[PDB]
Amino acid sequence: EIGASSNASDESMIETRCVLNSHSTAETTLDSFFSRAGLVGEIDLPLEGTTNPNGYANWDIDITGYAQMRRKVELFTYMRFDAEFTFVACTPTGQVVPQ
Amino acid sequence: GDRVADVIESSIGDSVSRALTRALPAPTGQDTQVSSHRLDTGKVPALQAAEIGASSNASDESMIETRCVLNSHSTAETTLDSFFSRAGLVGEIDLPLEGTTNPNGYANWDIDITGYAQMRRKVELFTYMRFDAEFTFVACTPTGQVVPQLLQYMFVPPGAPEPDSRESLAWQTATNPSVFVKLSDPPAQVSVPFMSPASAYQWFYDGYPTFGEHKQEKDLEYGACPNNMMGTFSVRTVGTSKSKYPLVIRIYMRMKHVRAWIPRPMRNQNYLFKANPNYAGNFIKPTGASRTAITTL
Amino acid sequence: LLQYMFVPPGAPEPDSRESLAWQTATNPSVFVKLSDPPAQVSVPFMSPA
Amino acid sequence: SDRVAQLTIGNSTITTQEAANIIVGYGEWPSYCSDSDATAVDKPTRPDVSVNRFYTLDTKLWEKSSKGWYWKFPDVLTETGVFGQNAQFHYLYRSGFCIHVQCNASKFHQGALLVAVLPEYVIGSVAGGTGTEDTHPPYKQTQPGADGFELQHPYVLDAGIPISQLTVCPHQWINLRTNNCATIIVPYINALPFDSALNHCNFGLLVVPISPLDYDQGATPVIPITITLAPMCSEFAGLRQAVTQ
Amino acid sequence: SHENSNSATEGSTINYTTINYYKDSYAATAGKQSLKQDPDKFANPVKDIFTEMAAPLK
Amino acid sequence: SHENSNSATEGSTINYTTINYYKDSYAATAGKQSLKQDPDKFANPVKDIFTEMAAPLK
Amino acid sequence: GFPTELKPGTNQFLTTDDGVSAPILPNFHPTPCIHIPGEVRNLLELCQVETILEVNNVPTNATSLMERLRFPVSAQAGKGELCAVFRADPGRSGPWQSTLLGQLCGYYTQWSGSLEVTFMFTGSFMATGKMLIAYTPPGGPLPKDRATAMLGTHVIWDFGLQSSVTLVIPWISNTHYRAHARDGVFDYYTTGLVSIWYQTNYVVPIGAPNTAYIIALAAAQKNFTMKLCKDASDILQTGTIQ
Amino acid sequence: GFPTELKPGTNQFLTTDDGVSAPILPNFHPTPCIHIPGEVRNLLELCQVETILEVNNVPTNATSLMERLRFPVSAQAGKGELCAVFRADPGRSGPWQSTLLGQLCGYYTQWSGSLEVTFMFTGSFMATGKMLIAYTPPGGPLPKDRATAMLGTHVIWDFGLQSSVTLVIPWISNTHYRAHARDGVFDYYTTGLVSIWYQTNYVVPIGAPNTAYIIALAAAQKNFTMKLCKDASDILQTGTIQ
Amino acid sequence: GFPTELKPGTNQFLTTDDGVSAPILPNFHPTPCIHIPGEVRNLLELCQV
């Protein structure tokens, strides 16, 4: 009822041996969890169409467009970080062209 | 509190391993010392006893008359790194335009190095190994030409959602590591750590993973080690439509930082199945070559 | 795309383009493209004498 | 001396007069698990004298056309005495072993036996003769029990591995001209500090006659082979109810 | 030169010389090992060792 | 090695080791953090702390 | 002028690669950081917080989704009857998916450590009783009765002025780490079972309700650790989020 | 900004090249290593272990594969008869292919060192005899009789309470290393021959068997060394391993 | 990460160029050199005969 996690340990409930635990906690840090790249936006530049018919597009920068990144980032309420953006461009068939 | 003599003087709890042998440095081969004739009774180094299980320890100096040779031949090339840190083919992934194997432009390859005999025979000389890895991805068309195509490789650890199509949502790779590379570029090369829940990979596992009745359907569990299941390797052609070129991908693995335990006899039969030491029963062949008679060459 | 392989004496010589010796588990090999600069490797002194 | 020996542990004793020394597996004695290597938190049990004793399992007949046999550990003991009870009641297990093989004949008999210990001895199948069938060994072949199992292709050891190289493993010879017993001491061999005693088998014991038995008509034709073994430094953990298999 | 200690050969008796450019230690080169052997552990694993000049069985 | 002090983690208690080639400090690598935790701030945020061995309510 | 030789691995984009990139804005200085309370430095801080465990994950309709958060106790015939069972895998499908510890462990393949479960009784002040809570180590089947279930790790719970009890699930395993198992042959890293049996009865006087509910809370201990970060199994998007 | 000039050898993939590669998983720490017995640090440790040598590699059918592991001795006419011959090349096709030393030397082109062969007698306790075991240095043909064979390196073996004898094959060569020879003109690195001749007879009393078998074991000495690692000659795969 | 600018003269093969190349065989040690008489160190030695 108090709102505190129970603090009974192994040594107080069962008969235990001595274990020299040397398992690192380095991989669960915020950098280790978040410093991985993921998709956040797509821009389409078709030859004919109604979406971007003129050969140019404007994309408002927001990272709530894709679930994989959004669920990870919304575990918290406030964040302060630096960013690293990467732009991968290809045709719909995936080939690379001199443009 | 210990009060009885059999508990006070007890040897229970000794956790240290008594070692009868110790390691000594040996950068070069052993030298030869000068020897002379010997004519006496009671001291015979030629006669041995192979029943004990120990290799015979008669040397050159005890059997024939020898000169002094200052041996300076290095032993550096037979180390585990020198023997194993060489790349070799371990898997092929085929991405045809039309076909029944990979018709959708994507493929999943479960990572295991028992698919090719050259690497498998070398790695199965031992029972346990602990090492780091270096993977290289060489991609080309069946005619061998290089074409302007963009590919994506993804590493899928066990428990992650496997992609089911070329437009699957798993390709957002928010957490999985991935590589975007073009065929015109040099091959992709990445370094992979030791990932086992145990202290070593074991290539032989005499057991089953679960309890229960061991009937016919629940029989393939023999030899199946869950600790060597390291996930899946997924490939695809980046794009919403179908690709223009059929592609073949070959994966090459190079070990490093190696440690090995418990050597075992080398295989002398042809391999049949993966993770399965079965051999063709009706076609057993000798280990070596044969000759007409024992008294002739 | 080409492959060069160094075959020391005693190793199995390849007999066809689809031979199994091209797995190069122990032999050194070079994968290179014609569009690339020429391949260059260094070789030691290999004589028994 | 060296040809005479006496092994005593627990409430049992083995004497011999034609010994050939004692082989210590990989030059290491069995030992307990240390605090820096243990991973489970509960206190393990060490029953001591009630499990560390010599168990005699069974007797096999050596003939002129015998091919060989193998035994799996600790499957031979999973159902014998207090050790079997502890192995059934507990989840984890850790121990070494001391193996003694008895085989005696007269001075007019001849023949040789190779006694070896091969860890993780996975048994392969004949794959249906031609090799296009994906078969797996049945229960009586993978886990024969305390009664052992007979080799079908001793030249390959039922795994496609040559017997001429089996001497890289800890081994002894039983040559009737010289000795009549063999002793190999095996420490704990595994990549885990503790493992199941029922699902996992650590090693296998091989007895293959390399030189055929031969004697003149009139001498005794019944030459038995006996296996005796004793667990060493046994530990158990993870206590629950008993499970049959 | 501050990096993680996460190679496969950490907690080992022998030391290597290697080259690394990243913060993870398993990305380095293979390097040079140390030349030590223990042949007796396989060749002469007996309890009571005997001299060459005598008879192994007496 | 004279650069601006304009990373996101300036004015923080913990220090990193990073590699930079530019004059702006936010272009550097992620580096290695320090391993410190305060689990009580979420697990035991009570006013008067009580020992394990006693009854929380008496 | 300085001779160099390009190595394999050039021109590739590795998503997890730690590198340096050119800054778009020169001499830009950010807004100063004021003191904001409740700062997180490690996920293990969040893994040690009690959250409700859904032992009763039978109901599925919206009008009855809310009673998955507790399960009942009532007066019985005094023969050691069974109340509930559940497994001890935090990152596996089942009851543990409702916990923050389970959701976070869904992001990591390998875990290691001991867990804890706390049960809170919400009956009337005038109700008494005793219960037996058992943990069965891996390898054994589900206990058939209380006499068989006592042979594992267990605690006897007595209702009183203290509403809660703690059952500690010790780390009993053969490996140092457990990979994430699932249906099929990979269950060799199973953790074990927890079952709750009646010890005496649920006795209530005249004038108090006959049925009471129990709420269970789950967390991890101070030796818990995770490893090998991966993507989570469930994707919360069906089409285009827009 | 720093001027560089690319040299020949860029963009190539050399399989034996020792290099650095980008790590996929950051801050990953492996499972700790417990003490596992029987650790190997050098192949020369394994090259010094006795394994059975197949001097009698005549039979080929499955029903008779097992007597390639030994060869017989029996009573003769007392005229210095011949028992068996074999060559001394470990990495060459022949008897040595059944040994671990031979299999490992199949991976290396050049070797150097002295070898050893141990013969174990498995007759009855009541059987006696003597044998002459000769090594013929390179350059000479096969000896025609015992009188010619004694002129090489030899040992006289006497049966007794010690079942075994050791024949040491000394390193007698003109080069420091021997490349692997085979059929044709490359046999200039031949090693020599070993032949076993009767010295007196195989005498047995009444009531003991007339034929006895001999087992031979092979290894290398402490000055043995290998060089120039290569792929092995035999490939143990006919189709696709699957 | 380290910015570089390629200069004229890249990707060319100059036959007389003194350079470094990747070794095919790691940890390979050659046959020791015994004393052989009549060693030449300079062509001017041969020009004076």
Ligand SMILES: CCCCCCCCCCCCC/C=C/[C@H](O)[C@H](N)CO
């Ligand atoms: C020539 C350079 C072109 C690349 C431009 C990339 C600049 C990106 C602007 C900063 C992005 C800040 C990260 C996200 C901040 C806000 O929280 C999100 N919009 C959330 O909606």
Ligand SMILES: CCCCCCCCCCCCC/C=C/[C@H](O)[C@H](N)CO
């Ligand atoms: C974006 C990176 C893609 C490249 C992914 C390569 C990762 C390879 C996973 C680790 C491989 C471990 C080596 C072999 C381990 C096991 O023993 C084998 N599966 C044996 O079957």
